[PDB]
């Protein structure tokens, strides 16, 4: 019916605003990135600080895991991405080519490829083994806010402050579809649904939308939260009830019934904008993270 997410752990350690949290595919770890130029790794179930991963010259906006949970990629204002070995903490590769801040990144399912999005308005596809850039997509006419592969990696979805969502064929780099929502507020976040059929997109008019990709139709709208300023991550929660999860500029974590669009729970505790949320792959566990006047991560757990 409704979840009952309760605070389990508050994770302190970052010296500046947190930018992104992501659970490892094996569910064992939480990774966090931050304006403090650091990646930190935490136990997903006990909240225990594990290690700090350092090397970027400026703040980090996004981090992402490889399928086997062995690698991380981060996106930095220093114009690079870095591929990291999680167990050692060593930088395996530095991905150079973007001409402005790198803002978002993701591995494909196979994890032989990384996709990046930058303020340079481009989307780049990188070879994980070599670190060389395979393709540069002239994707948008403003900063790229998010990039995400579908469930088999055959497609890429991107979003930009230009007001557009675009779907790209990974193999060729050609554009398959542009989603033009009549009236084009900046699109601050986008990702595929777990089944690859839909796309969840956030726009900077306090609105989340679920689109049918094949048909190009908006099926669901989620409102009631605050989002006009920051690129806040949104999630599909699939482990218990089927929810949509997002942070909010009113310091709250919002949870909606995916189907009914009704707010089912609001998570109170953070003392600044909740910029990032992640949903655990197997357990009813949420991780949330907040900006400059908070700087902490919170782990929450529900019965459904």
């Amino acid at each position: 019916v409704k979840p009952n997410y309760a605070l389990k752990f508050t994770l302190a350690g970052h010296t500046k605003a947190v930018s992104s949290v992501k659970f490892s595919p094996n569910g064992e770890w939480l990774a966090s990135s931050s304006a403090d130029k650091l990646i930190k790794i935490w136990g997903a179930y006990d909240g225990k600080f594990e290690k700090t991963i350092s090397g970027h010259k400026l703040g980090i906006s996004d981090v992402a895991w490889s399928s086997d949970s062995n690698l991380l990629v981060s996106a930095s204002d220093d114009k690079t991405l870095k591929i990291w070995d999680v167990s050692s903490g060593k930088c395996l590769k530095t991905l150079k080519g973007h001409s402005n801040y790198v803002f978002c990144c993701n591995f494909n399912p196979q994890s032989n490829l990384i996709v990046s999005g930058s303020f340079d308005e481009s989307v780049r596809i990188w070879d994980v083994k070599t670190g060389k850039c395979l393709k540069t997509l002239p994707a948008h006419s403003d900063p790229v806010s998010a990039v995400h592969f579908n469930r088999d990696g055959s497609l890429i979805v991107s979003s930009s402050y230009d007001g557009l969502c675009r779907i790209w064929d990974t193999a060729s780099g050609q554009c398959l579809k542009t989603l033009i929502d009549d009236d084009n507020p900046p699109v601050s976040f986008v990702k595929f649904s777990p089944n690859g059929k839909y796309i969840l997109a956030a726009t900077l008019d306090n609105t989340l939308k679920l689109w049918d990709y094949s048909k190009g139709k908006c099926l669901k709208t989620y409102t009631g939260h605050k989002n006009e300023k920051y690129c806040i991550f949104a999630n599909f929660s699939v482990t218990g009830g089927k929810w949509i999860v997002s942070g909010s500029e009113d310091n709250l974590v919002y949870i909606w019934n995916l189907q009914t669009k009704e707010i089912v729970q609001k998570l109170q505790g953070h003392t600044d904008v909740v910029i990032s949320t992640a949903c655990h792959p197997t357990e009813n566990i949420i991780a949330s993270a907040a900006l400059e006047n908070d700087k902490t991560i919170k782990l929450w757990k529900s019965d459904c």
Binding site: K16, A17, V18, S19, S20, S34, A35, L58, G59, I60, S61, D62, S76, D77, Y101, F103, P143, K229, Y230, C231, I275, L291, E292
Partner: peptide
């Protein structure tokens, strides 16, 4: 970075 409005 993402942590600052732009």
């Amino acid at each position: 970075a993402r942590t600052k409005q732009t």
